[PDB]
Each structure stands twice: as C-alpha cells, then as structure tokens.
Amino acid sequence: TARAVTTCRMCGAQDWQEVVDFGPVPLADSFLEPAASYDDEPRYPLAVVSCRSCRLMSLTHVVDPEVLYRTYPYTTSDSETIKKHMGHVVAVCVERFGIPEGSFVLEIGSNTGSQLKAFQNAGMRTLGIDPARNIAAVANERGIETLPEFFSVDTAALVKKTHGTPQLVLGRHVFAHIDDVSAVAEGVRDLLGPDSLFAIEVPYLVDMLERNEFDTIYHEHLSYIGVGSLVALFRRHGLRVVDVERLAVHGGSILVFVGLDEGTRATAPVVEELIALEKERGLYEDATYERFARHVAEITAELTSMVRSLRAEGKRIAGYGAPAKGNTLLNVCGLTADDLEFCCDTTEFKQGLVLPGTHIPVRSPEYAKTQAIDYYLLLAWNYGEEILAKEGPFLADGGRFILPNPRPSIVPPGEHHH
C-alpha cells in the first residue's frame, strides 16, 4: 500500500544513511472504535534515513496522502497557546515584511481556518487549500473560503487566475507532510510576484536531534527538516531562502521565509548563520545520527522500566493527551492498557475511541478527574507549560507527571528549579 522512497525529495541524490527502524507500526491518527479484536489493523513500515548530500532526514516510505488526509481529525476549539502563536505568526509576517492591509494571503493546510481568521482580523484577504473534506466543510461554513484539494501546480494556477497574486503564501506544519515538494516549489514560484513570500513552519531537525524527540517520527511526517536541505531544494526552482525565525512551538521549530531568486527580497544574515550552526552541531556527520539512535534505545528502555516499576508498586498511570506523537511513543515502548489505563484528551472526536496499536482507551478530562491517578505520562509535552499551569489541584494532591524528553523526568522535581 505504501510507496518506498528511492531518491531524495529535496536535492535528488540517493545516498541514504539508516538511522532508526521501528518496524511495522499502525497509523498514529487512525483511532479505532472499541472492539473484541483488532486483527485487521493496518501497519506500515516506520523507519528513518538521512540523506548524505543535503541531510534531509526522511522516512523510508510514503503512506498514501489520500488515505491520511481525506478524512482528518480536528478540534473546533484551539487552546490559548495555539491562538497566541497564530497571532504571533501574523505579527512576524506582516511587521517584518511590511505587508499592507488588504493584501492577499494564501494558506496551504489551512485546516479549520483559524490562522486565516487571524489574518482577516489584521485586514487581509484570504483563501485556504486543504484536502480534508470534513475539515474544509467546517472552514467554509464558518466563512473562511477553502478549496477542498491538495496543493498542486494546477491548483496554484487556478488560484492565480481567480484570486490573483498572493503577497504571502503560508504553510504551517504541512510542508513536511508532502512527498512531492518539488511540485510545491514550482506552484509557489508561479504564484509569487516580485515581492511575494512563501513561509513555512516546520519542526527543526536541530531541536529534534538535541532533545531526542523520536515520538515526532510518524507516517504523516515524511520529512524532518533543517535550513540546509531547504536551500538545496529551493535552489533548483528559482527560489531563495531570505529569512528564518526559530520558535519554541512543537518542541522547537523554524518559520522559513522564501522569495523569488530574482525578486526584491534580500537574504538576511541569519540564513547562513543557521547553516553554519547545523554544520557546527554535526548534522553532516554519520556519528550524530548513530548517537541519536543510541539515545532513542536508552530513552525507550528507561521509560518502559520507569512505568512498569511504578505499576509494580501499585501506582496508577494514565496518559495526558492523545496526540499523534503519543502513539509513536506508546507503540515503540510496547506499552499496553495494563501499563496506561487510559489517555485523557479534550477532543470529543477521540473520546470513547481506542488508540492505534496499543488499543488504550481515550477518555474525557471529566472522567479523568473522577479517577485516582498517581502519574500522568505527558504525551502532549509540547504544551507542558499550559497544561501544568492549570493542574494545580492534581499537583497539590501529590500527583506527578512523567516527561519523556529531553530525557525522562518527574514533575514536580525534588527542588525548586531556578
């Protein structure tokens, strides 16, 4: 069902270093209705390779995008963390590049349309592109125009014809989800005018390696990206990386701005600073990735033993959150419903379902509060600050959290952190 990678998406070479292999794993966003057996549950090979030319890190395989995205889970809410970051994206894009009010912003992977809504509140014209039909119907209903398609060279031409030249094209946590990134670059090139920008937000490979964030490896995530590999791609499509901002969101990310090579946007010094930093931290050396793989085996082992040791002492453990990355973590660690009795999640879509592979039940936060849990394994650790800030009562009662990265730890710690 899932097609194997041959050549590299970004630079086109074929010199792959193997880094880690988790074997066959079910899809992280395929939540299941509870049942007696789960024998026909699909699994796909989940393994990562590193390109020695440009140092894109890629999965060995590409699960069909039609299967992944045509019906996708979503929330109707949005946390305060998410809202604030979306406001920040607007501020950066508009203030750093002087985008006037009334300008046109096109967003790829626009989802329910809240990021575009933010742009509209700042006086912009918008349009979204997202293949999730269920989610696009919601955006459209709310008043956020969204084409229910994948982004392509042809869709790009349709947009230009009917909607004109965008001053900004935005893709947040979608660029790493697309196999044919050459085609994205080409459709972008055709959309961009002389001063237009293409901006993408993706998890940063430097942070992913240094903080041992192996749970962000899942089938939707085809690519794990540094600035180097983006320059290698965009070189070959008349595009130039002109600016980068590092961000704490999603365990360390980069928001990368790209313009036409012959356009009016000058390259800022930070671009080369980050490429020099990637060298200096060893992204172009085989040892670094063997070290990453070493860390993964070590963290995986001590996380399971910590959990099983506390259960042997008669402590009750649950998962806090049921995000996609939590399902990589739990499957790789081999944890079952005997290890975690449930995972609480605020998404109603997920409540009453069961997780892929491990089949742990997903329950509401209001059920979770009735139960005497001793430890929550914090699966949604990227929202650690927002979560801990509202869990005073649990913490005051002696409840604890287990954080999986950079190394497994226990919150609260034994002394004031300073």
Ligand X SMILES: C[S@@+](CC[C@H](N)C(=O)[O-])C[C@H]1O[C@@H](n2cnc3c(N)ncnc32)[C@H](O)[C@@H]1O
Hey, which bits of 290-398 come out as E strands?
A: 317-320, 343-344, 362-363, 375-378
204 binds ligand X (CB under 6 A): no
Say if residue 331 carries a ligand binding annotation: no
Nearer to Zn ion (CB atom), residue 75 or residue 182 = 182
Site for Zn ion in 24-83 (CB under 5 A): 51, 53-54, 56
Query: Does the annotation list 333 as a binding residue?
Result: no
Instruction: Tell me the CA distances in angstroms from 86 to 78, 90, 122, 201, 365, one per residue in order.
Output: 10, 6, 12, 11, 25
Please identify, using beta-carbon distances, which residue of 104 and 375 lies nearer to ligand X: 104
Binding partner of 131, given ligand X, Zn ion, none, CB within 5-8 angstroms per partner class = ligand X
Nearer Cβ to ligand X (183/277): 183
Strand 44-51 and strand 57-59: the pairing is antiparallel
Write out 373-387 in H/E/C secondary structure: CCEEEECCHHHHHHH
Q: Which of 195, 185, 196 shows the shortest CA–CA distance to 231?
A: 185
Stretch that binds Zn ion, among 5-13, 123-131, 144-152, 309-317 (CB under 5 A): 5-13
Residue 224 Rama label (left phi>0; alpha psi -120 to 50; beta): beta
Choice between 105 and 231, CB closer to Zn ion: 231
Residue 151, contacted partner among Zn ion, ligand X, none, CB below 5-8 A by kind = ligand X
Residue with tokens 């947009």: 159
In the complex with ligand X, which residue's Cβ is closer, 40 or 385?
385
Binding of ligand X by 174 (CB under 6 A): yes
Q: Which does 10 bind (CB under 5 to 8 A by kind): Zn ion, ligand X, none?
A: Zn ion
Helix (H) or strand (E) segment spanning residue 295: helix 286-312
| Residue 93 is labelled as binding a ligand | no
Partner interacting with residue 108 (select from Zn ion, ligand X, none; CB below 5-8 Å by kind): ligand X
Q: Hey, how many other C-beta atoms are within 10 angstroms of the C-beta on 417?
A: 6
Between residue 93 and residue 132, which ones bind ligand X under the rule CB under 6 A? 108-109, 111, 129-132
DSSP 209-267: HHTT-GGG--TT--EEB-HHHHHHHHHTTTEEEEEEEEE-GGGSEEEEEEEETTSSPPP
Name the residue whose CB lies closest to ligand X. Answer: 109
186 binds ligand X (CB under 6 A): no
Minimum CB–partner distance for residue 74 and Zn ion (Å): 32
Distance, in Å, from the CA atom of 62 to the CA atom of 49, rounded to the nearest integer, reads 13
Residue 380 carries which side chain, given as an amino acid letter?
A: A
> Distance (Å, rounded) from C-alpha 103 to C-alpha 397?
52
Check: CB of residue 206 under 8 Å from CB of residue 281: yes
Which residues bind to ligand X, rule: CB under 6 A? 65, 69, 72, 108-109, 111, 129-132, 135, 150-151, 172-174, 177-178
Binding residues for S-adenosyl-L-methionine: 111, 130, 151, 172
Binding residues: 8, 11, 51, 54, 76, 111, 130, 151, 172, 324-325, 345-347, 350, 382-383, 390
